[PDB]
Amino acid sequence: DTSIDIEDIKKILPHRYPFLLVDKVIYMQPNKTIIGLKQVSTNEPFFNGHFPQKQIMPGVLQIEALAQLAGILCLKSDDSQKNNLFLFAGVDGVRWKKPVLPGDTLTMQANLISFKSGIAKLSGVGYVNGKVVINISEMTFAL
Amino acid sequence: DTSIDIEDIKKILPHRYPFLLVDKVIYMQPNKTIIGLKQVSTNEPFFNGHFPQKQIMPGVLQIEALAQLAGILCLKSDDSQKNNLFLFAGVDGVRWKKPVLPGDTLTMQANLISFKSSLGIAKLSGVGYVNGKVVINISEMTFALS
Amino acid sequence: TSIDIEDIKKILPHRYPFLLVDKVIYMQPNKTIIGLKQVSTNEPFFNGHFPQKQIMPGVLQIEALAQLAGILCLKSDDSQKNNLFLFAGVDGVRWKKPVLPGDTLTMQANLISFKSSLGIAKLSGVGYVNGKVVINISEMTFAL
Amino acid sequence: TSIDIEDIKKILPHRYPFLLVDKVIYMQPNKTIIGLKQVSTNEPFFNGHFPQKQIMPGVLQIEALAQLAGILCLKSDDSQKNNLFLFAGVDGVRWKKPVLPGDTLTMQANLISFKIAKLSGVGYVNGKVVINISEMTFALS
Amino acid sequence: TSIDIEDIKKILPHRYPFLLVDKVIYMQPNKTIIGLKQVSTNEPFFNGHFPQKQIMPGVLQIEALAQLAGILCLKSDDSQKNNLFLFAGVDGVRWKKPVLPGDTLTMQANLISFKSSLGIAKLSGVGYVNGKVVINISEMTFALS
Amino acid sequence: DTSIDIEDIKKILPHRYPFLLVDKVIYMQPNKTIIGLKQVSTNEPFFNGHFPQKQIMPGVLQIEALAQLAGILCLKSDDSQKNNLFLFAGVDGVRWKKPVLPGDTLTMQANLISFKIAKLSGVGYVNGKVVINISEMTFA
Numbered sequence A: 001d002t003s004i005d006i007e008d009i010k011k012i013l014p015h016r017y018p019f020l021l022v023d024k025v026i027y028m029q030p031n032k033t034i035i036g037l038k039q040v041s042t043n044e045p046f047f048n049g050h051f052p053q054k055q056i057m058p059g060v061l062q063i064e065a066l067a068q069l070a071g072i073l074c075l076k077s078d079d080s081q082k083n084n085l086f087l088f089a090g091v092d093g094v095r096w097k098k099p100v101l102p103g104d105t106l107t108m109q110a111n112l113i114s115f116k117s118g119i120a121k122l123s124g125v126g127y128v129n130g131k132v133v134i135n136i137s138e139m140t141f142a143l
Numbered sequence B: 001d002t003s004i005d006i007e008d009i010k011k012i013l014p015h016r017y018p019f020l021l022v023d024k025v026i027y028m029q030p031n032k033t034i035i036g037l038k039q040v041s042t043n044e045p046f047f048n049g050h051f052p053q054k055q056i057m058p059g060v061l062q063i064e065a066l067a068q069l070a071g072i073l074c075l076k077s078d079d080s081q082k083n084n085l086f087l088f089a090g091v092d093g094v095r096w097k098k099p100v101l102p103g104d105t106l107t108m109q110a111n112l113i114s115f116k117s118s119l120g121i122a123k124l125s126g127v128g129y130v131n132g133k134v135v136i137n138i139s140e141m142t143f144a145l146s
Numbered sequence C: 001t002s003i004d005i006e007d008i009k010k011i012l013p014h015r016y017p018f019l020l021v022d023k024v025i026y027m028q029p030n031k032t033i034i035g036l037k038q039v040s041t042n043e044p045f046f047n048g049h050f051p052q053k054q055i056m057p058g059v060l061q062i063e064a065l066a067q068l069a070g071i072l073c074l075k076s077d078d079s080q081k082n083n084l085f086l087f088a089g090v091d092g093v094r095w096k097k098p099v100l101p102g103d104t105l106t107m108q109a110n111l112i113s114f115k116s117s118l119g120i121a122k123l124s125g126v127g128y129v130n131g132k133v134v135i136n137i138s139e140m141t142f143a144l
Numbered sequence D: 001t002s003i004d005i006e007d008i009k010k011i012l013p014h015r016y017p018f019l020l021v022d023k024v025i026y027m028q029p030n031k032t033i034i035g036l037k038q039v040s041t042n043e044p045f046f047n048g049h050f051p052q053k054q055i056m057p058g059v060l061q062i063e064a065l066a067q068l069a070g071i072l073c074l075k076s077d078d079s080q081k082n083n084l085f086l087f088a089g090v091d092g093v094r095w096k097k098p099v100l101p102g103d104t105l106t107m108q109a110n111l112i113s114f115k116i117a118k119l120s121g122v123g124y125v126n127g128k129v130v131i132n133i134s135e136m137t138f139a140l141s
Numbered sequence E: 001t002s003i004d005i006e007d008i009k010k011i012l013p014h015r016y017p018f019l020l021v022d023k024v025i026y027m028q029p030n031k032t033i034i035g036l037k038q039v040s041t042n043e044p045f046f047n048g049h050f051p052q053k054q055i056m057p058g059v060l061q062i063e064a065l066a067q068l069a070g071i072l073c074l075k076s077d078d079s080q081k082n083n084l085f086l087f088a089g090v091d092g093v094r095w096k097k098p099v100l101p102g103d104t105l106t107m108q109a110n111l112i113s114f115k116s117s118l119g120i121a122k123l124s125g126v127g128y129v130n131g132k133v134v135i136n137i138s139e140m141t142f143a144l145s
Numbered sequence F: 001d002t003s004i005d006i007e008d009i010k011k012i013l014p015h016r017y018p019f020l021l022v023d024k025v026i027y028m029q030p031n032k033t034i035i036g037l038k039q040v041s042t043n044e045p046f047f048n049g050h051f052p053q054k055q056i057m058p059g060v061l062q063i064e065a066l067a068q069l070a071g072i073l074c075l076k077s078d079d080s081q082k083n084n085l086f087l088f089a090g091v092d093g094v095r096w097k098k099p100v101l102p103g104d105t106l107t108m109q110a111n112l113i114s115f116k117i118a119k120l121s122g123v124g125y126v127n128g129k130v131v132i133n134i135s136e137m138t139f140a
């Protein structure tokens, strides 16, 4: 809606350095969808180990980035449960298509499928220059 | 029937700190299986951010650890392709049951399902346990050789 | 009884990258403590000790033992509402075998003497890896 | 000639956590260079500048531009087979806007004189100037 | 008349790994400040600048002086209850000698002009290693924010 | 000038970041003694953890700092044994007198006692004041 910067992401997510993988939330509509973006700089602690010969953002950290963007969605959609500590329950149908490299802007959109009580299921996609880098059919989450 | 120590691991996998998650390979049968373990300590760089109120090993790092073990199996199963930089192509059927906490040993088995010299296309299943109970299942991991 | 990592941080002030007790698996107040440290290649100190070969620094096997000793002192007698304990002295440290990534360091400390509200405690300590003695400490002295 | 990071580390000696150029998009030898720095929350410095509010250190934006300058000098003339370039002096540094996480800092350095070399530099975030550096002086050593 | 690291943390918001003042050995309000930064090989920036040879970044030397300047400003006049000082501009920076591991970066910053009205302060800065000048800075402009 | 700078220390000791704790050797007499200094800054990875509430250099890191200085000594005393990885075999008579804080210069001296298993003694000063005593360090 209005844009929501980092200082306010740290108020929603319990995550911190080196494991906060969302820089900005550019569009969020509660109970439907969220769009955020992660900047990929060589100046991140994980590159030095993946890999020294060739820096490629771990596929698992692109899941984690989406999974955190998905989290921001759930915790703004309903905060009657005042517990920001969400855990990944299950993930299904992850497909990585293109490497994500330093200097790239990872643009990510996750979409809610169902909510209950928590037990929430979301879909996720990430793009670098309008090309699909990673698909996630279903991310499940629990309190 | 040898245990493989860390220095030899670092000769197989191109992974370094802070993203190498195999501490030891304790069992490995080429073209078939692999069993190793990751030691979970409070003194790993990720636990400060996940989370400061409660320390829990990020389930994706478990995926990575299993993937890295799977990775080991592939490269000691067939290294005509002298390229160690493997990339995750897809993961499927991931269920996390139990939290992995500091002090735990994460024992991991991954099983090769299919391998094709075609492109470096290998499919693998995997389980992660802490104290004989299942903490993670992975139905299918797909990897591509560069 | 059984002290998990979250409860460890409530007792000790130690934080990353210098908190070297992952679990306390047996404790008896004013007598003994058994805890454990998981040695993984994913610790910041391994990159610098050493690149060619990874061996857990001997001084960190002391500190770990010293932190587990501290825990015992603080649970044994907490009339002194001060958690910041300082190393006073250490005596008769012998390293026998290397501690490597993949290893579980089993540690036990035994309280020898405590002088109440003077903060002067003395303890012994032994660390194990697969039933094998990897570090011995004759005497750790602490100041509250 | 566009340059990715792997090749950047072949030109610059800078490494983690003090390599502040992620890509080189345009490079004209002896004339101009344009590159970008991705400002993400997952950088080591942000934890300390500041806890309460995250703002890229102005000194690092200079540094980012400085290395951008450094590459340009090296790919202009490398009969000096010495990649170690030192900051000899900086002038006319003006910070207009803070740089925050999630920003793309775009950078253009211009060579002025090479004998010892002199360069100007500008940094953009969404077409808007966030930093001006009139003169960066460098000494090969 | 010397303020140690715990107190520096009460004045400055800067934290690890971007706090670059270890001690303030002399400070006179509205006029001058003298402090020192200890250069150790066990600093996280050394690994990247550079692997082949360890040299404390010219830019960080700026930061350290600026930070020392920062302290001076905050203890000169604290009616503006705001410790987040931002660098507005820096002028006439000349680096003379490399600062190496093992060196004690002794620093002096001197206030020139302050307009309480706005939140704008101007300071010169000098750094010495063994009484030898390593860094000159003619002007460091700051904005209270 | 009897000194050793960091770039030369790194050729003698294998140790690297974040566990190299000797910034400079200032004096060295083979088979007798060695003087070195470690700079203690707030910009060191360990201070964030020990402690957050009050920054004090771990007693153990003062041992290691003196140990590494003692390690440089044995290696330059006699490098017929072409092996730089020295292991601390034991340590005895460690007493810590004063807290070492950020801002301090840790001035260390180690002295060779016996070489066959090498034994050495160690002292650390902070502004002439004695902060650490090590009766005996054993090396293998």
Ligand SMILES: O=C(CC(=O)C(F)(F)F)c1ccc([N+](=O)[O-])cc1
Residues within 6 Å of the ligand: A056, A057, A058, A059, A060, A096, A097, A098, A099, A100, B015, B064, B067, B068, B071, B085, B086, B087, B088, B089
């Ligand atoms: O998970 C990994 C790293 C591995 O190869 C392994 F084996 F460690 F899992 C990864 C997967 C996909 C990409 N990608 O395409 O961006 C990058 C890295």
Ligand SMILES: O=C(CC(=O)C(F)(F)F)c1ccc([N+](=O)[O-])cc1
Residues within 6 Å of the ligand: C055, C056, C057, C058, C059, C095, C096, C097, C098, C099, C134, F064, F067, F068, F071, F085, F086, F087, F088, F089
């Ligand atoms: O403190 C060290 C590191 C060193 O080698 C040196 F040189 F730094 F002292 C150490 C001490 C004891 C063992 N051990 O248990 O065998 C291994 C390493």
Ligand SMILES: [Cl-]
Residues within 6 Å of the ligand: C066, C067, C085, C086, C087
């Ligand atoms: Cl302690």
Ligand SMILES: [Cl-]
Residues within 6 Å of the ligand: D066, D067, D085, D086, D087
């Ligand atoms: Cl530079």
Ligand SMILES: [Cl-]
Residues within 6 Å of the ligand: E066, E067, E085, E086, E087
């Ligand atoms: Cl500042």
